[PDB]
Amino acid sequence: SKCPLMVKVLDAVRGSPAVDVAVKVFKKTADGSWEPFASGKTAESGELHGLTTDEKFTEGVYRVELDTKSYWKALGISPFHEYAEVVFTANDSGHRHYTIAALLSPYSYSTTAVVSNPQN
């Protein structure tokens, strides 16, 4: 009933949840390379859920890339960052659910982790 991975994104310039920011989730392989894990556009309210399956999202290193640049390039603003990425290692270690947050601005971005534990 709940997926671990989820992204939220806000736009600090117009007090708005950034919509349609492109999200790409990359999972670290055995050899030490990256393969695609999930992909999607931020919905109309900032959130992007139903990204992975509560069982496909297994232990490992991850990297969420939010294409922040085309987002700002779309409204007349040339951004600093080429994009924004978030590397963490989700795990079966517990604290099984995660939501990544973004506070996007032309020359600055804060990223927030928020892990939770369901009822075991």
Is 78 strand, coil or helix? coil
47 is in an annotated binding site: yes
How far is the C-alpha of 57 from the C-alpha of 51, rounded, in Å? 9
Task: Output 3 or 83, the one with its CB closest to a copy of itself.
Answer: 83
Q: Least distance in Å: CB of 111 to a copy of itself?
A: 6
How far is the C-alpha of 77 from the C-alpha of 119, rounded, in Å? 44
CB 20 within 8 A of CB 41: yes
Q: Which tokens hold the place of 9? A: 């994104």
Q: Which tokens hold the place of 44? A: 């109309």
4 φ/ψ sector (left φ>0, alpha ψ -120 to 50, else beta):
alpha
Residues that bind a copy of itself (CB under 8 A): 10-17, 45-46, 61, 77-78, 80-83, 85-89, 93, 95, 101, 103, 105-116
Task: Output 40 or 106, the one with its CB closest to a copy of itself.
Answer: 106
Task: Output 4 or 11, the one with its CB closest to a copy of itself.
Answer: 11
Task: Output 55 or 120, the one with its CB closest to a copy of itself.
Answer: 120
Q: Least distance in Å: CB of 93 to a copy of itself?
A: 8
65 is in an annotated binding site: no
CB 46 within 8 A of CB 19: yes
82 is in an annotated binding site: no
Binding residues: 8, 47, 110
Binding residues for L-thyroxine: 8, 47, 110
